[PDB]
Amino acid sequence: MVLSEGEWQLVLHVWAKVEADVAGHGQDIHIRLYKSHPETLEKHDRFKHLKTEAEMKASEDLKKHGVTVLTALGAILKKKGHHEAELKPLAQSHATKHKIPIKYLEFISEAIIHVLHSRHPGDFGADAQGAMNKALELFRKDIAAKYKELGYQG
Template sequence: MADFDIVLRSWGPVEADYTKYGGLVMIRLFTDYPDAQKMFPKFAGIAKKDLAGNAEVADHGAVTLKKLGELLKAKGHHCAIVKPLATSHAKEHKVSLHSYTLITDAVCKVMGEKAGLDGAGQDAMRRVMHKIITDIGVTYKELGFAG
């Protein structure tokens, strides 16, 4: 639980502006991992130079960070949140488990640069996300999704 508390101490700025931070995270994801942009069909054709001004990209990032905020605030008691998330991401979106690792990296970097999440906090975020990703993987396995 300490890891959740460490991350939540820097979550305030993100929560205050999910759209801003969501856009930053998505842009970081697509910049650091260009192939990730192909995983989002509606974003695949957007030129890198146009990502920053794209409201749909920022909105998608905001939705992602809001869900992450729910997971963080559950402090490990996230089964009721993870199950439907994993189900939709397996059945509808076909999101690989590795993709969650990439978004974790982007979130850590943006929070480190813009929200004051220091190195220890970024390590805590990675541990928290490892647990969440593992739990998503359990649901994926139950559904027969290789993820």
């Protein structure tokens, strides 16, 4: 699949707003991920004891991890689909070490969309939401292909 230049412009314009508060976006995204899909929290041995939204917001390690995640994703989105070298290490770790099924990447994709609409309801209208849906779908499709290249169905 492919995004137009104009869809990429909407993706990166919204990403600038994420970059104005990376840590806060990361926390909101992970809290939604873990509350709606508790099975995902189980993958994070160091976080899996956190239960309430207050406890997750108080974890300095979870806050740091949200920055790590969104920094890697931002680098990928800024490549506008030419992200092979960025995606390679991410698939390697998530498929062979952490064993994150592709389904969990759909869960976190939903959470990103929800948080972007919650924080930026004006700038994240239908056009902008459609573009970022497409960018995250391309990301999942390409990392699923790398999973299979490594021998993992995901």
